[PDB]
């Protein structure tokens, strides 16, 4: 339990403590699935709330699939700029 | 010496055909009153794969003329035949792909398949995928029909023999390289025990007429006469010529 608390604070995680590859520790597909589900969940929420019409929703749906946005914050800012123009 | 490999196959112990997954024998309808006078209509219910056979098979259901029930037949499917299609078989059937007609009821140049050698044997000729028989003429006297066979030979067949209009489906199969020993393994796994094959010159004299010697060589002409006996017929049997 004491060791787990140290790990939660960021300790024992340097290059000298890693034996598997980055993929073995955390698969890149798992990271992608988390991010795309985050982006798609936000787009449906905005469209249902009426903040975005279906025409702009469809454009942003295929941009997120095309790796246009690196995180949720980048998508929200892009929506604001699109609505500001 | 001992009994050679090609002699052991006739005993039929481990060299029998692997027929567990076969859909059934592919035959035409039994030649009956409806076929030889008029026609009878069937329906293609499904087109299915057959293990050990390149060409697909079609299941066609006909009504029993003399009993209230349905009779199912297994046909070798031709190109263009689809599920739900009506198939017409008999002397008075139309000239369409999939129909079964006597050879004397079609004009010259008609392409047919699953042709009967004799009327009623339910199909013997042009059964493999992509093969067909070409009708080249008729002889109304003596009721004979002249056709061309896939091997190129010319045969005289009775005009009452039946055949299916079209060409056997699945053609072009042998144009694709097998590319590996594994695919050859799975091919003959559904057919029979004949693969792989060990060369005779790699054996000992007790095993094969080509065996032995301080080098691998046949040592005598590989052209064997038609009159040789079992244990001698290894190589090129009754060869008229050799070379490229």
């Amino acid at each position: 339990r004491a060791h787990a608390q140290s790990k939660r604070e960021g300790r024992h995680s340097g290059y000298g403590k890693r034996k598997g590859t980055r993929e073995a520790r955390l698969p890149s597909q798992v990271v992608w699935i988390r991010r795309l589900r985050v982006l798609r969940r936000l787009l449906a929420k905005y469209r249902d709330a009426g903040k975005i019409d279906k025409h702009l929703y469809h454009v942003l749906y295929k941009e997120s699939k095309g790796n246009a946005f690196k995180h949720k914050r980048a998508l929200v800012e892009h929506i604001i700029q699109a609505k500001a123009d | 010496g001992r009994v050679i490999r090609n002699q052991r196959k006739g005993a039929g112990s481990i060299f029998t055909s692997h027929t567990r997954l076969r859909q059934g024998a592919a035959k035409l309808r039994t030649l009956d009153y409806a076929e030889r006078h008029g026609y009878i209509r069937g329906i293609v219910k499904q087109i299915v794969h057959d293990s050990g056979r390149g060409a697909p098979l079609a299941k066609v259901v006909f009504r029993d003329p003399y009993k209230y029930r349905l009779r199912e037949e297994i046909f070798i499917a031709n190109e263009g035949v689809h599920t739900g299609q009506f198939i017409y078989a008999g002397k008075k059937a139309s000239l369409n792909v999939g129909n079964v007609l006597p050879l004397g009821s079609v004009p010259e140049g008609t392409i047919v398949s699953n042709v009967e050698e004799k009327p009623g044997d339910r199909g013997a000729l042009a059964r493999a995928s992509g093969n067909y028989v070409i009708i080249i003429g008729h002889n109304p006297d003596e009721n004979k029909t002249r056709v061309r066979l896939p091997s190129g030979a010319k045969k005289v067949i009775s005009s009452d023999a039946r055949g299916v209009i079209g060409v056997i489906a699945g053609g072009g199969r042998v144009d694709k390289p097998l590319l590996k020993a594994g695919r050859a393994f799975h091919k003959y796994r559904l057919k029979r025990n004949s693969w792989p094959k060990t060369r005779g010159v790699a054996m000992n004299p007790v095993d094969h007429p080509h065996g032995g010697g301080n080098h691998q060589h046949i040592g005598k002409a590989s052209t064997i006469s038609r009159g040789a006996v079992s244990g001698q017929k290894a190589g090129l049997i009754a060869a008229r010529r050799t070379g490229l």
Binding site: - | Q46, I47, V48, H49, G54, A55, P56, A58, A77, N78, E79, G80, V81, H82, T83, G84, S94, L95, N96, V97, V106, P107, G109, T110, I111, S129, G130, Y132, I165, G166, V167, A169, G170, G171, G172, R173, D175, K176, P177, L179, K180
Partner: protein, 91 residues
């Protein structure tokens, strides 16, 4: 991006079997794995099952065809020959 220059689908075989043999398999692998128009429902939903069997995802129609293509060149010629001969029997 473009991942391979010329091997295409035959990149799964690596460097084995020879280039000429891999080239021949490439032509027939693309044909057998493609989607074809259904002559019954008009959609592009026909794919091969076993060799010589072609089924449409819609409308549940199965058509007997070639080993790696829906229709071979020989089968097309046979249809024209039968159609020409049929027209000379009724009229």
């Amino acid at each position: 991006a473009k991942r391979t220059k010329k091997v295409g689908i035959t990149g799964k075989y690596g460097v084995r079997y020879g280039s000429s043999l891999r080239r021949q398999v490439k032509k027939l692998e693309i044909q057998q794995h493609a989607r074809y128009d259904c002559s019954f429902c008009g959609k592009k939903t026909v794919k091969r099952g076993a060799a010589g069997i072609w089924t449409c995802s819609c409308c549940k129609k199965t058509v007997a065809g070639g080993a790696y293509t829906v229709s071979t060149a020989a089968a097309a010629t046979v249809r024209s020959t039968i159609r020409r001969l049929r027209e000379m029997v009724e009229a």
